[PDB]
């Protein structure tokens, strides 16, 4: 009785990651120096894996962990992606709480991020080109220009980060953000407690509104005084950055964040698709729009960065932060220039709130669907189970609504789904292409969509995707950089705590294999066969008909 | 198929609480000023409630949460005591780790707590009366004399508390204590994974060894140079302290810690007693020995405190700490005076290790039995469930093995089982004496032990016990004192965090009643009846035969 389900694909393409995460990853890794790795990972890994995750859930009709009946030893990969989805939900909800606070603050004729006369603002808060306040001048620049009305509003007005000295002194949860976080978790609860398709209104709003706003920002941005300089930066490619490995790791993780692969969302979502649904069309369409949305997102962001650098008399590289709060500074700065700013402020933060809600809904659905498919008891107690998932997320999100929650969020955004998600998607590709068989997988898609995937897809699923995923995983560990939020440098123990979060999900795969073998009764050969054979044909193990014990299985594409 | 089970009662009487917690509670609340409240709470509340908890588990054959089939609305009381048992297990295991470290350090001809020439020792570490090192003299005293070899060894040698400034800067888990904690959780796992009576050797050792060592310490202590002054302090009663409420709250919580009532241990343990077992004899015997053990424990401790004050030229009130590490300073100081100290050091810490292991085993059994009786699935997966309980305890015990884990332990020892345990035992007494009926309870004991409890027990169970429990609960909240470890005063937020821990268990009772009523289907009257009627006669609810809807039920003793 599984609840099987134009604007659908376009809404799926837009995500809090494409509108909030991509901009700062692009800004940090240079404008076009990030596009080259991003497009490569999308075509050789992102799009291929998106098609695999869609087909895996649409053929087995299962969530992230229960699709591993095809190869039992790999259920730890399903538990790992569900843990990653939970970790990301903690700080995703905090981004929605910021949008809710910004929305509530937008209902004023005078927006709070336009001038420096407020209580939160520090003496060091220069009004761009004396826009509102005309005092002194710009005679000094800063590594990160946090002395702008919009920056000061985000840092002091909303986060109260000025009250935290680091991840060692996070402080107490901010009450205004605690109220916003509670509204977010209440909306999330009543959007998931009665099922998966229970919530459709947010999906509809997050299908056209995001594109419309991006278009308005893009058209207005290109006409801003110094937008051209930003456009030039976006177009220029820094080849030296390509030699460095950071851009490649950032691009790969962003691909899985922007597409949703490696969180269990795609498999859980496709578990309710019709068996005949064309995953290939959906993969191509979503990936193509994601590439366009990401490109136009960076163009708009760099146009605003160009104007901001012109208005603040700073260099584009030093005009804004490269953290998770860049869109809460750049977009507010752009809305102010738009006539009828109050209207645009409300419309923009309504879009951010809506986009974040679906993003959090999909992640929590992956956790709920994944665990409910594993334990049918949780399927009959959804309202109670949803409460547990939402409440746990709210409590652990309380760490990021603290005066130093940006430091905790930077840590989570870097380790909750970095090497861990690349390792999980690598294990899934290896599990389906080598242990299960790309040939069997292709026959599965031939049964579902009526055609066997082309050699390009088969080669990517078995060799190209895994090889590139293995390279970025190894490079992530070999060339790991100490975590830093802007000027602040994290204490060494925070990096170890971050690696502990990363390993937490990664260790589930080895631990499950140990558990599966120990829990199995038989000879070492028999136990190994039971762990690699489809759980629908374990009788073949009794008859000694193991395809994985034949060299042709590993020689089949 | 429940696994139904002289030295037994004597071993049950001795506990880490009687040998480790009582001494510092007695020292903090004066010698005999604590005995008066302690003896009162034991006779009017402790012993009466011990008999109720023993009979409740021996008649219903259930753990802390599943015994509430008699009155359904109260299962939150069972969940509350299981949560308290888990909270206490976190820092109980850390006390066992200290005993393991002290045991490993005792295998030397020269004990580490006898002199101040070691690396851990600070310049301020005076050898008592220049015992080992003869330099300078005693010309200044201190609020807490932490400049003694034994004190410095505990604080700097073992805890490394000198590396933490407070609960704000706990630091990293000490690796030597991390190794000791891992051995403790491994021993606990293999003592619980295969059942309840799986471990009997520790029970046998902790039946005579504790008494023997206490006797040796008592006989040697009374002969120590300044022991008389300590004896005089123990005998003297400070009436002004009796007027204060702290001694009463401390005495009441110690009674439930020393007897095991309010952690779910007594009910779970009695669930495996034979139906004919005489709870009354066991209650009288255990309570009588607990009163004697506690009295002689304080006599030995105050005799060592008297000698230490004489040797350190300090006042007994300022000679030692009043925290959870008093026995790791006083007993080491006494062992040193005993000829063949190395032998006595090993024997003493072997006793502490053994006593702690059973204490932790009983608490974890309450959590495992309580949850396994609730969920029969956990009964079939004991080795896996035990792992989860032990592993979770180990991870949360990692907070107390940190350089500032004594601060976390002080917080847990004050809030994990303080007002919360008094509230839980109050709710259990109210639930069985008023909602279920002391008359019904007495008929249950008449069926089990062949006699109806006397009016004294019935009056205590319905009026005396609850009234005194209600008084200490209200007094605990009305006259709460800010937490302080020795000189250190906790930051105000730590007190709120502590009250959050206390309320966590306490809120389970209200939350369960809300859940039970909402989960029940029927009229408000019908739902209320279903929540107060024995779950074996819910047909009476259909026939409108509710004893609790008759005034005589609340007028019956
Ligand atoms: C750092 C943790 C180290 C031990 C943590 C993991 C140990 C043992 C799990 C394990 O391996 O057992 C799995 C079930 O796993 C779960 O529940 C989810 C719990 C995973 C824990 C999340 C960790 C959070 C930091 C049982 O899998 P299964 O036997 O295939 O389940 C089948 C059954 O559900 C329905 O047939
Ligand atoms: C600060 C938490 C606020 C919500 C936390 C509590 C909510 C809802 C529990 C609740 O009320 O449901 C109970 C089962 O409760 C449990 O599991 C233990 C879990 C308790 C959570 C420990 C809290 C740790 C800080 C279900 O009780 P039941 O319906 O009588 O169970 C019968 C079934 O087990 C076998 O028939
Ligand atoms: C299994 C689930 C519960 C794991 C939860 C993971 C997250 C929420 C945990 C794991 C490690 C944690 C961090 C460990 C240590 C510190 C330093 C302290 O000074 C502030 C909190 C902070 C920064 C913690 C924030 C929350 C944290 C990131
Ligand atoms: C078991 C899991 C799901 C939930 C446990 C997480 C709870 C206990 C955590 C999450 C966030 C935490 C809070 C985060 C920050 C602070 C500020 C600090 O100055 C005092 C403690 C306080 C107020 C913490 C109390 C404990 C807390 C609420
Ligand atoms: C611990 C879990 C289970 C639930 C409780 C969450 C706690 C940590 C949360 C919930 C309510 C919060 C408080 C709400 C409002 C205020 C007032 C102001 O001074 C800011 C801090 C303070 C005091 C918050 C501190 C953190 C807080 C106490
Ligand atoms: C904001 C954070 C701190 C807490 C969130 C708690 C939420 C999830 C809780 C608190 C009150 C709860 C509601 C209380 C009562 C009912 C009526 C019942 O027949 C269906 C569920 C429902 C509607 C509950 C759903 C979950 C609920 C909304
Ligand atoms: C726990 C903290 C956050 C308090 C939350 C208060 C609010 C958000 C909660 C408390 C009780 C809740 C209500 C309880 C019962 C119902 C009936 C249900 O069929 C629909 C939702 C509705 C109408 C809930 C809406 C949300 C609600 C009003
Ligand atoms: C068929 C029956 C036995 C199903 C049993 C349900 C079990 C397997 C499910 C239901 C509730 C779940 C737990 C709920 C909450 C937590 C705490 C979290 O920090 C780690 C995961 C953990 C520990 C979950 C593990 C999986 C779980 C234990
Ligand atoms: C946020 C932290 C502190 C608490 C989280 C509590 C969550 C994980 C707990 C509390 C109540 C629990 C539920 C209580 C009862 C049942 C019914 C049972 O047949 C299946 C499991 C299920 C549905 C439990 C799943 C786990 C659960 C939802
Ligand atoms: C620090 C820890 C997490 C390291 C990893 C420990 C893992 C591998 C351990 C912890 C507890 C173990 C389980 C405990 C009990 C059983 C039941 C037994 O009949 C088969 C093996 C099985 C199912 C074990 C499998 C391996 C296991 C899951
Ligand atoms: C449901 C279970 C997991 C609850 C766990 C309760 C215990 C282990 C938790 C709850 C609140 C916690 C404390 C909250 C805040 C601080 C201050 C920080 O600077 C050091 C850790 C310290 C002192 C925490 C230690 C661990 C703690 C006491
Ligand atoms: C879900 C429950 C059962 C387990 C979660 C508790 C874990 C995540 C907690 C318990 C104790 C914690 C540690 C306690 C103290 C420190 C020192 C600090 O300077 C860095 C973080 C570090 C090293 C913590 C890391 C996270 C930690 C290991
Ligand atoms: C997080 C949970 C799931 C498991 C991991 C526990 C972590 C917090 C524990 C386990 C091993 C511990 C480390 C073991 C030994 C050392 C070396 C020395 O410098 C002291 C600190 C340090 C570095 C410890 C810090 C805390 C630590 C990292
Ligand atoms: C010390 C802390 C950090 C971790 C403790 C982990 C313990 C509980 C784990 C680690 C290794 C585990 C063992 C590994 C394998 C087996 C064999 C299996 O057929 C029965 C269970 C048994 C014997 C496991 C019991 C639980 C176990 C001992
Ligand atoms: C996880 C960390 C603490 C490592 C723990 C290592 C030690 C304590 C563990 C690892 C593997 C374990 C062994 C694995 C399997 C068995 C067979 C079982 O029938 C009895 C216990 C025994 C013999 C275990 C004893 C404890 C053990 C040796
Ligand atoms: C009959 C079937 C459905 C039984 C289901 C088992 C459920 C009810 C049991 C088994 C595992 C348990 C969970 C294991 C671990 C945790 C995490 C802890 O922080 C809070 C309690 C919590 C959340 C437990 C609640 C009760 C639990 C969810
Ligand atoms: C210490 C923290 C980080 C992790 C704790 C994990 C614990 C609570 C989890 C991990 C593995 C879990 C078990 C995995 C599978 C089963 C079998 C199922 O039929 C009943 C529940 C049971 C027995 C789960 C109970 C909860 C469990 C023991
Ligand atoms: C902050 C939180 C812990 C406050 C307390 C919330 C409690 C009272 C709420 C949270 C979730 C709620 C449950 C959610 C869903 C259901 C299923 C519904 O058909 C009957 C009520 C029931 C079983 C609710 C009972 C009340 C409940 C347990
Ligand atoms: C963007 C919306 N879409 C595409 C149709 C989704 O699939 C998800 C979703 C679908 C329905 C309801 C809630 C969430 C939200 C996931 C994304 N993480
Ligand atoms: C002191 C020993 N006794 C008395 C017989 C106990 O009941 C417990 C126990 C019994 C058997 C095995 C383990 C633990 C340990 C509890 C105490 N908290």
Swiss-Prot record, chains A, B:
Annotated InterPro entries: Na/ntran_symport, Na/ntran_symport_noradrenaline, SNS_sf
Resulting phenotype, residue 397 to P: In ORSTI; the orthologous knockin mouse mutation results in phenotypic features similar to ORSTI; results in severely decreased, if any, norepinephrine uptake; 50-fold increased KM for norepinephrine; decreased dopamine uptake; decreased localization at the plasma membrane
Extracellular side, ranges: 29-32, 107-173, 223-246, 303-342, 405, 486-488
Gene Ontology molecular function: actin binding; alpha-tubulin binding; beta-tubulin binding; dopamine:sodium symporter activity; metal ion binding; monoamine transmembrane transporter activity; neurotransmitter transmembrane transporter activity; neurotransmitter:sodium symporter activity
Catalytic activity line of the entry: (R)-noradrenaline(out) + chloride(out) + Na(+)(out) = (R)-noradrenaline(in) + chloride(in) + Na(+)(in); dopamine(out) + chloride(out) + Na(+)(out) = dopamine(in) + chloride(in) + Na(+)(in); dopamine(out) + chloride(out) + 2 Na(+)(out) = dopamine(in) + chloride(in) + 2 Na(+)(in)
Positions with a binding annotation for dopamine 2: 322
A GO CC term assigned to this protein in UniProt: synaptic vesicle membrane
Result of altering residue 92 to F: Severely decreased norepinephrine uptake
Pfam family, one: SNF
Residues at which (R)-noradrenaline 1 binds: 15, 85, 89, 257
Modifications the protein undergoes after translation, according to the UniProt entry: Palmitoylated; palmitoylation regulates protein levels and neurotransmitter transport.
Primary subcellular site in the record, as a coarse category: membrane
Activity regulation info: Inhibited by mazindol, desipramine, nomifensine and nortriptyline.
Residues reported to bind (R)-noradrenaline 2: 27-28, 322
Keywords on record: Cell membrane, Cell projection, Disease variant, Disulfide bond, Glycoprotein, Lipoprotein, Membrane, Metal-binding, Neurotransmitter transport, Palmitate, Sodium, Symport, Synapse, Synaptosome, Transmembrane, Transmembrane helix, Transport
CDD domains noted in UniProt: SLC6sbd_NET (cd11512)
Cytoplasmic-side positions: 57-75, 195-197, 273-278, 369-383, 433-462, 510-557
Membrane topology: Multi-pass membrane protein
Misc: This protein is the target of psychomotor stimulants such as amphetamines or cocaine.
Family, per entry: Belongs to the sodium:neurotransmitter symporter (SNF) (TC 2.A.22) family. SLC6A2 subfamily.
Reported function: Mediates sodium- and chloride-dependent transport of norepinephrine (also known as noradrenaline), the primary signaling neurotransmitter in the autonomic sympathetic nervous system. Is responsible for norepinephrine re-uptake and clearance from the synaptic cleft, thus playing a crucial role in norepinephrine inactivation and homeostasis. Can also mediate sodium- and chloride-dependent transport of dopamine.
Disease the record associates with this protein: Orthostatic intolerance: An autosomal dominant disorder characterized by lightheadedness, palpitations, fatigue, blurred vision and tachycardia following postural change from a supine to an upright position, in the absence of hypotension. A syncope with transient cognitive impairment and dyspnea may also occur. Plasma norepinephrine concentration is abnormally high.
Subunit composition and interactions: Monomer. Can form homodimers in the cell membrane; homodimerization is mostly mediated by cholesterol and lipids, and regulates neurotransmitter transport activity. Interacts with PRKCABP.
Protein name as catalogued: Sodium-dependent noradrenaline transporter
Species per Swiss-Prot/TrEMBL record: Homo sapiens (Human)
Gene: SLC6A2
């Amino acid at each position: 009785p599984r609840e099987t389900w134009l604007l659908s694909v376009v809404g799926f393409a837009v995500d809090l990651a494409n509108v909030w995460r991509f901009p700062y990853l692009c800004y940090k890794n240079g404008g076009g120096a990030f596009l080259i790795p991003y497009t490569l990972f999308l075509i050789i890994a992102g799009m291929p894996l998106f098609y695999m995750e869609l087909a895996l859930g649409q053929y087995n009709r299962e969530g992230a962990a229960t699709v591993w009946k095809i190869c039992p030893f790999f259920k730890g990969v399903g538990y790992a992606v569900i843990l990653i989805a939970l970790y990301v939900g903690f700080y995703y909800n905090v981004i929605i709480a910021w949008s809710l606070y910004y929305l509530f603050s937008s209902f004023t004729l005078n927006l709070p991020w336009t001038d420096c006369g407020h209580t939160w603002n520090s003496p060091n808060c220069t009004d761009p080109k004396l826009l509102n306040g005309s005092v002194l001048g710009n005679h000094t620049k800063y590594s990160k220009y946090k002395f702008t009305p919009a920056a000061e509003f985000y840092e002091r007005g909303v986060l109260h980060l000025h009250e935290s000295s680091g991840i060692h002194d996070i402080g107490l949860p901010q009450w205004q953000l605690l109220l916003c976080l509670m509204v977010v978790v209440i909306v999330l609860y009543f959007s998931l407690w009665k099922g998966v398709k229970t919530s459709g209104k947010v999906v509809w709003i997050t299908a056209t509104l995001p594109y419309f706003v991006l278009f308005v920002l893009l058209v207005h941005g290109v006409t801003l005084p110094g937008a051209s300089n930003g456009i030039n930066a976006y177009l220029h490619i820094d080849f030296y950055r390509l030699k460095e490995a950071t851009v490649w790791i950032d691009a790969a993780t962003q691909i899985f964040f922007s597409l949703g692969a490696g969180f269990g969302v795609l498999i859980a979502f496709a578990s309710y698709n019709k068996f005949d649904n064309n995953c290939y069309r959906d993969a191509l369409l979503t990936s193509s729009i994601n590439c366009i949305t990401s490109f136009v997102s960076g163009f708009a962001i760099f146009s605003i960065l160009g104007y901001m650098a012109h208005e603040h008399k700073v260099n584009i590289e030093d005009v804004a932060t490269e953290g998770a709060g860049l869109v809460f500074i750049l977009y507010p700065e752009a809305i102010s220039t738009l006539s009828g700013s109050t209207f645009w402020a409300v419309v923009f933060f309504v879009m951010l709130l809506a986009l974040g809600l679906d993003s959090s809904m999909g992640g929590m659905e992956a956790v709920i669907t994944g665990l409910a498919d594993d334990f049918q008891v949780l399927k009959r107690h959804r309202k109670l189970f949803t409460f547990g998932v939402t409440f746990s997320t709210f409590l652990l999100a309380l760490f990021c609504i603290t005066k130093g929650g940006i430091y905790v969020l930077t840590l989570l955004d870097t380790f909750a789904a970095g090497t861990s998600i690349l390792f999980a998607v690598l294990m899934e590709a290896i599990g389906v292409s080598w242990f299960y068989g790309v040939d069997r997988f292709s026959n599965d898609i031939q049964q579902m969509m009526g055609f066997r995937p082309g050699l390009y897809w088969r080669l990517c699923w078995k060799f190209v995707s895994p090889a590139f995923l293995l390279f970025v995983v190894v490079v992530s560990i070999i060339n790991f950089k100490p975590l830093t939020y802007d000027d602040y440098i994290f204490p060494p123990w925070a990096n170890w705590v971050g690696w502990g979060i990363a390993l937490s999900s990664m260790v589930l795969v080895p631990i499950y294999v140990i558990y599966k073998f120990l829990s199995t009764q038989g000879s070492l050969w028999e136990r190994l066969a039971y762990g690699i054979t489809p759980e629908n044909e374990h009788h073949l193990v009794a008859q000694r008909d193991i395809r994985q014990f034949q060299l042709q299985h590993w020689l089949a594409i």
